[PDB]
Design a protein around this ligand. Structure first.
Ligand SMILES: [Zn+2]
Ligand SMILES: [Zn+2]
Ligand SMILES: [Zn+2]
Ligand SMILES: [Zn+2]
Length: 520
C-alpha cells in the first residue's frame, strides 16, 4: 500500500550544453551514453529557458525550483545589491566556515540567497527528511543550489588543494567517504597523460581546424591546438586547470559515484536524490567555442563517462529502480571570430565607465551608474539623492543613448516591461527574470549573435536567443516511456515533472507545469 517511487533520482545538468550537441556529434557517440538516453528514454527537443539572463546560477536554480528569478531570488551568478552597496555572489555566505579547506573564498558558501524551495527540498519534506540528498559539482553554485536548503551534503571543488570540500552550513566536518576520495588524488591520475583527442584528430570533421584565431589558450601552451602535453605540470601549478579539460567531468562523475556509495543512495525504498553538474563543458566551451575540436572531444569523452556512470547505476541501484533527467543550464553562442569567418551576424556588446562619463557631462555628477551587469544597469541611489537627480530622468537619458548602439535591439525600464513594444517570448522572459530587490533599473536586449567584449575569444551565454535558451531535456528510467516530442516546454517544467513522478508537492515558487507525455 505504498506510493510507487524510484529508489534514486539523478539530476544531471551538462553545463553550457546546446541542444544540438546531441546531434552534431551523433555519429561518434557510443551506445551507452547520450544515445542510451535517446534510445530508451524520452527527449524533449523543443525546451527553452523562460527567463533572462541565461547564466549558471539561475539555470540550476530554475531547473530544481521550477521558478524564475523574479520569485526565487537568484538573479544571476552575481547581482548588485543596493542595500549592501556592492555586487553579491550568488552563494557567498560569510556566516559559515570552510570544511575540508582553509580557504574562505572557496568554502564560505550556502544556499541562503535562495528564496523558494527546490524539488530536493520537497522530497525531504515528503519523506520526513529520511531521503539522502547530495549535490556534486566543480562549481560551488552548481552544487549548492540544486541540493536545496537541507541536503545530506553539497560538495564542490577547491582550486587551491584539488579536493572536494563543503561549508559549515552542511556539516562540521567532511564525511569519511569524502576524505577517502580526496586522498586518492583522482585529479592527478586523470591529467597525468596530458590531453589528446580520444579519436584521431583528423576525424573531427564536425569541428573547425585546430588552430583558429577565435580560440583561447589552455595551461602553458601558446597555441589553441592539441596535443596539450604539459597538462600534468600545468595542473600541479594551478589545480583549477582541470576545470577546463574533459577530466573535470570525469572527476565529477567519480565523485558522484563515491557519494552514491558513501551515503547508500538507492539501496532501500526511500527515494534518494543525487544532483551532479558537469561543469567542464562550460569551461572548455568558454575558452574554445562550440565549433572547436576541444569541445567536440569533451563531449565524446563525457559521452563515455556517462555510459560508465549509467552502468554503475545499473549495478549499484538496478535498472528500472532509478530515474535520470539530463538537461543544461543554458546553451552558448558561436564565437564572434567564427561567425565573422562565415559571414554570419555577430559582434561585441565598458558601459559603466563610458556611460558615467556621459551622465557626468549631462547631469554633473559622477558614478551615477552603480553597476552594469547581466545586461542591466543599476543607478546609485546615494548619488542621485545627494545630487538631487531623478531616477526617471537619469534612466531616460541612458536608454536614449543605448538605442544608438549597433548591438542594442531593445532598451526598457524594468518598471515598464509589460507595456513595452516588445514581442513574446522576450517580454515575458524579461518579466520572469526581473527580481525587484536584486535586478537593475534598465533591461537591455542585444541583437542576434552579439556577445560580451569581456573576452574576445571563446564564447559566452546570457541572452534569450535560441542558441542560449534551447536546452536538451532527456528523461530515462523508472516511470519513463521511450519517445520524443517537438511540443514547446519551459525549463521551469522540469521540477513539476519530477514532482508528479514522485507524487510530492511542487516547489514553493513553481510556475511551470508537468510534462505529461513523459510520464508513462
Ligand atoms: Zn552554466
Ligand atoms: Zn583547437
Ligand atoms: Zn534511500
Ligand atoms: Zn558559462
Amino acid at each position: 500500500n505504498a506510493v510507487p517511487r524510484p529508489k534514486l533520482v539523478v539530476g544531471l545538468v551538462v553545463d553550457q550544453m546546446r541542444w544540438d550537441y546531441l546531434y552534431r556529434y551523433y555519429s561518434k557517440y557510443g551506445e551507452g551514453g547520450f544515445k542510451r538516453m535517446l534510445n530508451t528514454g524520452y527527449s524533449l527537443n523543443n525546451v527553452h529557458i523562460d527567463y533572462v539572463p541565461t547564466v549558471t546560477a539561475i539555470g540550476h536554480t530554475s531547473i530544481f525550483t521550477g521558478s524564475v528569478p523574479s520569485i526565487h531570488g537568484i538573479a544571476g551568478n552575481d547581482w548588485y545589491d543596493k542595500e549592501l552597496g556592492k555586487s553579491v555572489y550568488c552563494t557567498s555566505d560569510e556566516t559559515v566556515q570552510p570544511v575540508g579547506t582553509t580557504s574562505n573564498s572557496v568554502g564560505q558558501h550556502s544556499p541562503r540567497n535562495l528564496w523558494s524551495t527546490t524539488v530536493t527540498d520537497q522530497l525531504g519534506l515528503a519523506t520526513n527528511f529520511t531521503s539522502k540528498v547530495v549535490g556534486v559539482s566543480l562549481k560551488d553554485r552548481a552544487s549548492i543550489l540544486p541540493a536545496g536548503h537541507n541536503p545530506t551534503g553539497a560538495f564542490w571543488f577547491d582550486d587551491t588543494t584539488g579536493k572536494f570540500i563543503t561549508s559549515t552550513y552542511y556539516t562540521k566536518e567532511l564525511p569519511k567517504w569524502v576524505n577517502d576520495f580526496n586522498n586518492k588524488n583522482v585529479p592527478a591520475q586523470l591529467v597525468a597523460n596530458g590531453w589528446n583527442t580520444l579519436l584521431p584528430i583528423n576525424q573531427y570533421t564536425e569541428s573547425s581546424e585546430d588552430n583558429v584565431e577565435w580560440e583561447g589558450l589552455l595551461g602553458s601552451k601558446k597555441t589553441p591546438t592539441f596535443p596539450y602535453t604539459d597538462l600534468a605540470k600545468d595542473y600541479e601549478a594551478k589545480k583549477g586547470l582541470i576545470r577546463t579539460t574533459p577530466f573535470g567531468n570525469t572527476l565529477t562523475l567519480q565523485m558522484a559515484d563515491a557519494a552514491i556509495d558513501g551515503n547508500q543512495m538507492g539501496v532501500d525504498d526511500i527515494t534518494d536524490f543525487l544532483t551532479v553538474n558537469l561543469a567542464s563543458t562550460d569551461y572548455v566551451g568558454h575558452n574554445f567555442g562550440p565549433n572547436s575540436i576541444e569541445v567536440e572531444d569533451t563531449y565524446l569523452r563525457l559521452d563515455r563517462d556517462l555510459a560508465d556512470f549509467f552502468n554503475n547505476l545499473d549495478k549499484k541501484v538496478g535498472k528500472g529502480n532509478y530515474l535520470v533527467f539530463l538537461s543544461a543550464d543554458h546553451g552558448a553562442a558561436h564565437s564572434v571570430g567564427f561567425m565573422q569567418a562565415h559571414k554570419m551576424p555577430t559582434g561585441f556588446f565598458d558601459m559603466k565607465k563610458e556611460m558615467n562619463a556621459k551622465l557626468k557631462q549631462k547631469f554633473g555628477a559622477d558614478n551615477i551608474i552603480a553597476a552594469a551587469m547581466n545586461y542591466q544597469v543599476y543607478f546609485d541611489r546615494k548619488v542621485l539623492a545627494d545630487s538631487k537627480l531623478e531616477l526617471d530622468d537619469v534612466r531616460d537619458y541612458v536608454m536614449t543613448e543605448l538605442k544608438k548602439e549597433p548591438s542594442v535591439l531593445y532598451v526598457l525600464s524594468t518598471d515598464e516591461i509589460w507595456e513595452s513594444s516588445i514581442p513574446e517570448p522576450i517580454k515575458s522572459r524579461v518579466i520572469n527574470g526581473y527580481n525587484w530587490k536584486r535586478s537593475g533599473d534598465i533591461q537591455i536586449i542585444s541583437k542576434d549573435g552579439y556577445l560580451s567584449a569581456y573576452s574576445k575569444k571563446g564564447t559566452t551565454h546570457s541572452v534569450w536567443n535560441s542558441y542560449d535558451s534551447h536546452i536538451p531535456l532527456l528523461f530515462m528510467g523508472w516511470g519513463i516511456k521511450q519517445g520524443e516530442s517537438n511540443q514547446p516546454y519551459h525549463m521551469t517544467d522540469i521540477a513539476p515533472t519530477v514532482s508528479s513522478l514522485l507524487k510530492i508537492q511542487f516547489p514553493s515558487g513553481a510556475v511551470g507545469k508537468p510534462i505529461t507525455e513523459v510520464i508513462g
